[PDB]
């Protein structure tokens, strides 16, 4: 029987043949089986990565350090956009633990399996096809881990290979002919500022202390 000619439509897999959509759930099965020798031939590693993993079971949750707070305030609140989107998510997620075991109604489930998938795609990205997002406190648009992670002024590019740093300084500059080539006239007030941790030593103390 067969392999459909498959289609991406939003966040769903859709097939022709010779139309049944691929419910999220379908695809877990599969892989949950597929072979070891099948994996690997194509890119996988028994222990470190498996196609069933490629799809979402359970979603970790990033602790505060990753997404924290406060404001203009004190008594009146604070938060980043992951705590907000890391809600739209624990949000619809109980909207569905509240149907299956409470009020249960056939084709009006799936209105809300796309929410829960959708916010879980959004919490990871949103500069894609169709709708971006926004409010439900700030307006726009949004946040996402990805753009945090993304090119320039974003982690890796802007915080890891290029950080802002201590003991530095900056001014205007001008030329002065009675200075030797390898010198640099540092103005005083700055020298009064930047510091160099020296270690105490028989050798230095006398001078050293007269500084302290």
């Amino acid at each position: 029987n067969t392999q459909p000619t498959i289609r991406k439509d939003g966040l769903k897999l859709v097939g022709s043949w010779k139309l049944r959509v691929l419910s999220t759930e379908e695809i877990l099965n599969i892989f949950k089986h597929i072979s070891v020798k099948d994996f690997t031939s194509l890119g996988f590693n028994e222990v470190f990565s498996r196609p069933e993993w490629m799809i979402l079971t359970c979603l970790p949750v990033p602790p505060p350090p990753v997404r924290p707070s406060i404001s203009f305030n004190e008594s009146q609140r604070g938060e980043d956009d992951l705590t907000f989107k890391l809600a739209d998510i624990l949000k619809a997620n109980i909207s569905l633990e509240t149907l299956e075991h409470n009020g249960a109604p056939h084709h009006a489930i799936e209105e809300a399996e796309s929410l829960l998938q959708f916010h879980v795609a959004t919490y990871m990205d949103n500069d894609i096809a169709g709708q971006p997002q926004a409010l439900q406190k700030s307006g726009r648009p949004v946040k996402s881990i990805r753009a945090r992670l993304k090119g320039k002024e974003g982690r890796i590019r802007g915080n890891l290979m290029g950080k802002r740093v201590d003991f530095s300084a900056r001014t205007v500059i001008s030329g002065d002919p009675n200075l030797e080539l390898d010198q640099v006239g540092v103005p005083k007030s700055i020298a009064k500022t930047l510091t160099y941790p020296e270690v105490v030593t028989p050798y230095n103390i006398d001078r050293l202390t007269q500084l302290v």
């Binding site: 305030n73 004190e74 008594s75 001014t171 205007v172 001008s174 030329g175």
Partner: protein
């Protein structure tokens, strides 16, 4: 005076050549939608809250607003205001971490909403020094 620097008669600077004034104004208001939470302009001092600024307050009288002929500079508080959260948490603007001058005029009005309003102006005279552009 190379690769475009130029040399200036420090004598004639003194006589007053290329001098300027330099005012800068700071601003403040009181609260938001509170039926019981209202910033207050005052000259603070702890009162269970104790997060007040590194710098000095003693240049503010009681309305919490420096007087005019007063010379400020450093991290000096120019406008004391406290915001009570449960209590007297400081929240008062100090002068630029770099500027220094003299208060010139201080204004006290209000906004559409019957709001307490303040705009403090500080004046400095800046003199053609070494690195200045022209």
């Amino acid at each position: 005076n190379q690769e475009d620097s130029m040399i200036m008669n420090q004598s004639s600077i003194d006589r007053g050549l290329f001098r300027s004034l330099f005012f800068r104004s700071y601003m403040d208001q009181e609260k938001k939608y509170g039926m019981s939470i209202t910033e207050t302009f005052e000259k603070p001092q702890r009162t269970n809250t104790l997060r007040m600024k590194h710098g000095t307050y003693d240049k503010l009288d009681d309305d919490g607003l420096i007087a005019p002929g007063v010379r400020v500079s450093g991290e000096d508080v120019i406008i004391g205001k406290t915001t009570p959260i449960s209590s007297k948490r400081d929240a008062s603007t100090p002068l630029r971490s770099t500027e220094n001058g003299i208060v010139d005029q201080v204004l006290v009005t209000t906004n559409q909403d019957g709001l307490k309003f303040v705009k403090v102006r500080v004046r400095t005279t800046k003199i053609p020094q070494i690195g200045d552009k022209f």
